[PDB]
A paper describes a structure:
The proteins SO_1444 (ParESO) and SO_1445 (CopASO) in the CP4So prophage from Shewanella oneidensis were recently characterized as a typical type II TA pair, with an important role in CP4So maintenance after its excision in host cells. The toxin ParESO can severely inhibit cell growth and cause filamentous growth. The antitoxin CopASO can neutralize ParESO toxicity by direct and tight protein–protein binding. CopASO can bind to a DNA motif in the promoter region containing two inverted repeats (5′-GTANTAC (N)3GTANTAC-3′) to repress the transcription of the TA operon.
The crystal structure of the ParESO-CopASO complex was determined by the single-wavelength anomalous dispersion (SAD) method using a Se-Met-labeled protein. The structure belonged to the space group P43212, and was refined to a final R/Rfree factor of 0.29/0.30 at 3.80 Å resolution. The resulting heterotetramer adopted an overall very open, V-shaped architecture with the organization of ParESO-(CopASO)2-ParESO. The antitoxin CopASO is composed of an N-terminal RHH domain (β1, α1, and extended α2) and a C-terminal toxin-binding domain (α3 and the extended loop). The two neighboring CopASO molecules dimerize via the RHH domain to mediate the DNA binding. Notably, the intrinsically disordered C-terminal domain is induced to fold into a partially ordered conformation upon ParESO binding. Moreover, the conformations of C-terminal extension in the two CopASO molecules are distinct, and part of the extension is further folded into a helix (α3) in CopASO (I). Structural analysis showed that the toxin–antitoxin contacts were mainly mediated by the C-terminal domain (α3 and C-terminus of α2) of CopASO and the two helices (α1 and α2) of ParESO. Remarkably, surface-charge analysis of CopASO showed the C-terminal extension was predominantly distributed with negative charges (such as Glu54, Glu60, Glu61, and Glu86), which perfectly complemented positively charged regions in and around the binding grooves (such as Arg18, Arg22, and Arg90).
Author numbering:
A (entry chain C): 2 to 51, 59 to 78, 82 to 93
B (entry chain D): 2 to 20, 26 to 49, 59 to 77, 84 to 93
C (entry chain B): 5 to 77
D (entry chain A): 6 to 93
The structure:
Amino acid sequence: PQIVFTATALRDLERLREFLRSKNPPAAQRAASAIINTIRKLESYPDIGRSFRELLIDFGDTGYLAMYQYERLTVLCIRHQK
Amino acid sequence: PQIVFTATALRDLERLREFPPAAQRAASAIINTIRKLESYPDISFRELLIDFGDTGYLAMYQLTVLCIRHQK
Amino acid sequence: KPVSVKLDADIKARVEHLAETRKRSSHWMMREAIREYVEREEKREALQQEALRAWEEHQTSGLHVTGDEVVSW
Amino acid sequence: PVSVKLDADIKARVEHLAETRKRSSHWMMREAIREYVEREEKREALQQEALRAWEEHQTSGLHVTGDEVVSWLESWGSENEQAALHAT
């Protein structure tokens, strides 16, 4: 698949970034790796969750929630803070 | 406060220790936690937070008697 | 084993609305709401007892602490 | 109001729990539904804003690739960071 993010998922990432600043000391680089892991594990075994499903991304303090769809480019829509 | 520690919290640390810079890493996160308790004890007792690196631990306490610090 | 529960009205309205959406029953609705409550409080009030047992072991014996300087261990 | 629910063994774990923390079994059960419906209404909200987010992507058609945000993310916290672009 193509692993595509939506505009809503990009700006959920932006909120996210601009947050960590006042969040974990260096978990900015810790959250980033967790997503890229989640991004490239979607590039392979694309599945999990609950007709599209969800996916949790765990890192340090707590975790977030990726939501995505599908049949050749799992569009990634929305990643709120759970 | 005197910042006391219990035996159940003492062995929860020895459990911890066993588990690469870490020997001097997570120890610093607790001494910070220890000394911010000597001033700000937060606030029915509340077991405080603890976060460094991979994940975070859980030091419950109530002198501030520190009883049990499990891995969360 | 059935048992009656008086509902706050207004919620029951929020209960029955989510049942319309999910296409499930108002009975199975709460049937989970009870499980997920105890399924959580059973663990939380399980670690409450752990820390509470530590208080029992201290309130009857000695201890040490100061700061990275033990005393009466 | 006043409608009845029926559980199985779970009610025993309730009545037992409604005795440890010495609270009313009838009260406890109610808090369960409120917490539930509160959490669950917020899940129904995330659904739509997720569902909507899509509807917008299907209409607008613009997106960014995982690699671009993989490219963006690997510079997080390392002073010279990056932004995100918007391809069509």
